[PDB]
Design an enzyme around this catalytic site. Structure first.
Site, PDB file in Angstrom:
ATOM      1  CE1 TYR A 148      21.442  71.491  34.318  1.00  0.00           C
ATOM      2  CE2 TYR A 148      20.454  69.890  35.808  1.00  0.00           C
ATOM      3  CZ  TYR A 148      20.407  70.622  34.634  1.00  0.00           C
ATOM      4  OH  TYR A 148      19.295  70.464  33.807  1.00  0.00           O
TER       5      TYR A 148
ATOM      6  CG  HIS B 178      21.324  63.928  40.173  1.00  0.00           C
ATOM      7  ND1 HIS B 178      21.135  62.739  40.833  1.00  0.00           N
ATOM      8  CD2 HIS B 178      21.305  63.631  38.854  1.00  0.00           C
ATOM      9  CE1 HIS B 178      21.017  61.761  39.951  1.00  0.00           C
ATOM     10  NE2 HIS B 178      21.121  62.278  38.743  1.00  0.00           N
TER      11      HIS B 178
ATOM     12  CG  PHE C 163      25.383  64.252  29.637  1.00  0.00           C
ATOM     13  CD1 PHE C 163      24.559  65.331  29.815  1.00  0.00           C
ATOM     14  CD2 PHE C 163      25.908  64.029  28.385  1.00  0.00           C
ATOM     15  CE1 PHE C 163      24.290  66.187  28.779  1.00  0.00           C
ATOM     16  CE2 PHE C 163      25.642  64.888  27.345  1.00  0.00           C
ATOM     17  CZ  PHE C 163      24.837  65.966  27.543  1.00  0.00           C
TER      18      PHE C 163
ATOM     19  CG  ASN D  64      23.440  59.709  30.903  1.00  0.00           C
ATOM     20  OD1 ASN D  64      23.723  60.904  30.908  1.00  0.00           O
ATOM     21  ND2 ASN D  64      23.230  59.030  29.784  1.00  0.00           N
TER      22      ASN D  64
ATOM     23  CG  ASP E 142      21.998  62.008  44.037  1.00  0.00           C
ATOM     24  OD1 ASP E 142      23.091  61.821  43.472  1.00  0.00           O
ATOM     25  OD2 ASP E 142      20.903  61.931  43.438  1.00  0.00           O
TER      26      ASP E 142
ATOM     27  CG  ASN F  78      20.178  58.240  35.092  1.00  0.00           C
ATOM     28  OD1 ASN F  78      19.592  57.224  34.724  1.00  0.00           O
ATOM     29  ND2 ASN F  78      19.606  59.433  35.103  1.00  0.00           N
TER      30      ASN F  78
END
Length: 196
Positions: free
Chosen positions: A18, A23, A69, A71, A96, A117
Site C-alpha cells: 500500500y 491513499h 487501518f 479508518n 490525500d 476514512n
C-alpha cells in the site's frame, strides 16, 4: 517565529503493498521530512504507529505515521497526542485530497472529512473535534464516485506520480518555512505552487 504545530501526522495504510498507493500521500510527506532531517521512525505499539521527533529552527516537531487501518487512524493520533499533551489545534494531518489535482497541495485549518476514512476517524477520536490543521495533497479523482475507493487504493501512473512527488517535495519545503516563518508565510508559498 510563532507557529501552532507540535505534531505532524501522515495518514497511511500499512505494508509494502500500500506504500505507493494514492491513499498514502500523507505518509510520503512525513517520510520525506524525516529523511531530510535524519530521523528514524520507531515502531511504538503504544501509539499504533511509527513515531519520531525532530528539531526544526529550534522548534520541536513530533511525527507519526499510523500502522492502523486507515479508518482507525484516530487511535494512533489520539494515543500519541494525549500522551504528549498535544491539543487537536496543534496537530497537522497530511492526507490525500480528492478535490485537488496531482501537483497541488494546500494547508487548511479545520473542515469536514470529505469522505476520507482517516480524517473521519481522527475527528471522532479527538473528541469530535474538527479543528486540527491539514496538509491536503492533491491526488485528483475518478470520473464516477463509485470508483473512488479503487482509485485511492491505486498507484498513480508514472507521470502523475512525478506531479505528486513534486508536491510532496514543495510541501516539505513549506513545512520547514512553517517552522521558521510561520503559518501565513508557509501557506502563501504553498498555495502558489503547481507542478508542471
Amino acid at each position: 517565529v510563532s507557529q501552532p504545530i507540535k505534531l505532524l501526522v501522515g495518514l497511511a495504510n500499512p505494508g509494502p503493498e500500500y506504500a505507493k498507493t494514492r491513499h498514502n500521500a500523507g505518509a510520503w510527506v512525513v517520510e520525506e521530512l524525516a529523511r531530510i532531517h535524519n530521523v528514524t521512525l520507531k515502531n511504538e505499539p503504544k501509539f499504533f504507529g511509527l513515531t519520531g521527533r525532530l528539531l526544526i529552527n529550534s522548534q520541536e516537531l513530533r511525527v507519526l505515521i499510523p500502522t492502523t487501518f486507515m479508518n482507525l487512524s484516530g487511535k494512533a493520533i489520539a494515543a500519541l497526542a494525549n500522551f504528549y499533551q498535544i491539543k487537536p489545534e496543534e496537530i497537522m494531518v497530511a492526507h490525500d485530497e480528492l478535490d485537488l489535482p496531482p501537483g497541488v497541495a494546500k494547508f487548511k485549518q479545520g473542515g469536514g472529512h470529505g469522505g476520507h476514512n482517516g480524517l473521519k476517524d481522527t475527528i471522532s477520536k479527538l473528541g469530535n473535534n474538527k479543528e486540527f490543521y491539514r496538509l491536503r495533497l492533491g491526488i485528483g479523482h475518478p470520473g464516477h464516485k463509485d470508483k473512488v475507493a479503487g482509485y485511492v487504493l491505486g498507484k498513480a501512473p508514472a507521470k502523475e506520480q512525478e506531479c505528486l512527488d513534486a508536491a510532496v517535495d514543495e510541501s516539505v519545503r513549506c513545512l520547514e518555512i512553517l517552522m521558521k516563518d510561520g503559518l501565513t508565510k508557509a501557506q502563501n508559498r504553498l498555495h502558489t505552487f503547481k507542478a508542471e
